[PDB]
Symmetry: D2
């Protein structure tokens, strides 16, 4: 499933991120806001049960109980994903966190990359309950989707109940590459951009998340 959250407020933030005149302080600020928001959207796609509670006025009433909110694991890719994950964690107060330090080897070429090398420098993940936990992986950008598929190689084994991928911008090439391999993955993103340049950068994109966040 592909959820493109393009509501006025998320598109308003995306425009601040895209704008090159935005400094890293405000850039990181929005990522935290968007992870907050995107987290809410994801909340509304979870499994809920119909329950009954008694109000103060003795009256019994029917309400919902999203049992899944107690089975969430958010994996942080680090780098630009930190402000984002900081936002998601705000929305899922009961989520455990894991980190899979992934970074693609940025190559310069004469053609548009359809694939890139990805190295993993750090790995600390919580136990993932099979058929129970909902895993959320954050990545500000998805270009060739090489970074994402690399982290997935492992997450997918755990066989979590669900798998969500949050990103700000995704390239058409990337969404299709990921969802054609794991179409069961709920992929959230505020927008999808057309192409990748010869360095594997999304166009129009927003630049190098890492550079925008800590430059």
């Amino acid at each position: 499933p592909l959820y493109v959250i393009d509501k006025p407020i998320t598109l308003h933030i995306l425009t601040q991120l895209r704008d090159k005149y935005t400094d890293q302080i405000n850039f990181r600020k929005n990522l935290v806001r968007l992870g907050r928001i995107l987290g809410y959207e994801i909340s509304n796609t979870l499994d809920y049960e119909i329950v009954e509670v008694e109000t103060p006025l003795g009256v019994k009433t029917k309400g919902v109980d999203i049992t899944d909110l107690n089975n969430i694991v958010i994996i942080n890719i680090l780098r630009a994903a930190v402000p984002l994950v900081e936002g998601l964690l705000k929305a899922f107060p009961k989520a455990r966190q894991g980190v899979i330090g992934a970074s693609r080897v940025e190559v310069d070429g004469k053609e548009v990359p359809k694939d890139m090398d990805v190295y993993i420098y750090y790995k600390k993940i919580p136990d993932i309950r099979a058929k129970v936990d909902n895993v959320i992986i954050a990545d500000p950008m998805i270009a060739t989707a090489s970074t994402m598929l690399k982290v997935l190689e492992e997450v997918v084994k755990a066989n979590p109940k669900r798998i969500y991928i949050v990103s700000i911008i995704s390239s058409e090439y990337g969404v299709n590459k990921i969802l054609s391999k794991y179409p069961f993955i709920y992929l959230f993103t505020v927008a999808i951009d057309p192409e990748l340049n010869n360095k594997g950068y999304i166009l129009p994109g927003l630049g190098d998340a890492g550079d925008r966040a800590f430059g």
Copy 2:
């Protein structure tokens, strides 16, 4: 405009609020959450506009710029409305705040009328820029709407650009009264409950907002 925000997450928190076994800490904690979510939703009804921004990759693209995020005044009626206004202020960083104290007229009798006058003992409100500001009045529960009415008479004279009313549970009698008298108002709420018992409590409701929050 009536906007009932009955999504899985909001109703989940609402269930939490109704449940009589939810202590005051968690009760307020959830009230803050809803202010955030209810604020997010309010944002998407805001008046935006299309702009053009240049990204780091030299490409220029179109985006959104919700300028009304600068012209916002949130009015806090105190009491249990505090945790709520707190979350709404987090959803509107550039929003100014005003507060008002109010006590409805105490007329001899154990029973309670539905149309009572209200005494506004304290009133501190930022200047409401005519035709430019968007006023948001926060109030946990609208049972009889006597207070909402008293306040609205004041805000109206200011000639806002838009007026919003946020609440968790709002009695059917209340919605009707407010919207029928002021049709142009955006009244957001997580749920509209049926009746009001003689004591004026919303049924099933969630008890006394104030006592749940600071009891």
Copy 3:
């Protein structure tokens, strides 16, 4: 006892609060900050006990457990105290909040006020456990000490283990008045201004708190 918290950072904030040019968004922004830092300072004055915990390395070591952090009740006198309490609760996660819509009566100015009338509109407070709970009462200003003494009147009969008063600015008259009656109160403030005018406003002080925060 009197605790004047004049650490470089607190005085920095205060300078912002006193500055008549500080707008209400920043005014309240600073009050939340100051509430955090003061709750921190306050937390250090609390009673604690030596314990023993087991590190993952299978090694016991002595430690500190501030047991009272689970027995705190913050009393919000509302209005301009709001932002300040918002900050204090951030330092005390497990604290129960109570509210008191108290407000001294504006005087004529024909005589130097000593004992002012205090109206009590609303009052919802948690069960204060005698000899166990530590009560924290917050009000940004303390001039004639009337609003506070009014509040204390009740808090004392509850026989708490400790009573803490927190503010930004206190007057000499007020600190002595409160402390002459209840010498056991732990009174925190960032500054003690020397005089009150005839209207009951601290000089140089910082103006009317409510108007600064909600004007």
Copy 4:
């Protein structure tokens, strides 16, 4: 300069971290917390000046202005430091963040050398202004100081007006290895532990910050 910040509130937080039973969510929560506190203490050593501000009462008064609050760069060396930096960044709203990913050297032999090389694979740091910016480098635990030394050797090259190192626990060894090479570095820690066991673990320490925060 060595600053051991062992106040009741910080030791209380430290005690929880050392306690093996503290779950991951709570472990990271405390890091964020110690981060704002340590941030508060650091803020009192920053350059500041006396200024004249006029209050609403129409009278001028002196105050403090910590101008150095606009010249802070925080360096996130990732890993278990994410929670800590998060807190630090709250204490310094105007701080710019930079990141540098570092990994230890593969060294066959169960035992871990006191001194060892460190590979820095990612480095994105804002423009450190010479003799102006204050560089804060958070790192939960300094055992062998190997990572800190590697990172310092880079940071120092920019001639920062000042360099701070914030850590929860630090071994005597590491403290001596840092200050012995750079005695001008402000090394803030909550507790210094005696020895390091053969696996590079501080004793009593608190185990592996990575597994404690992400496991």
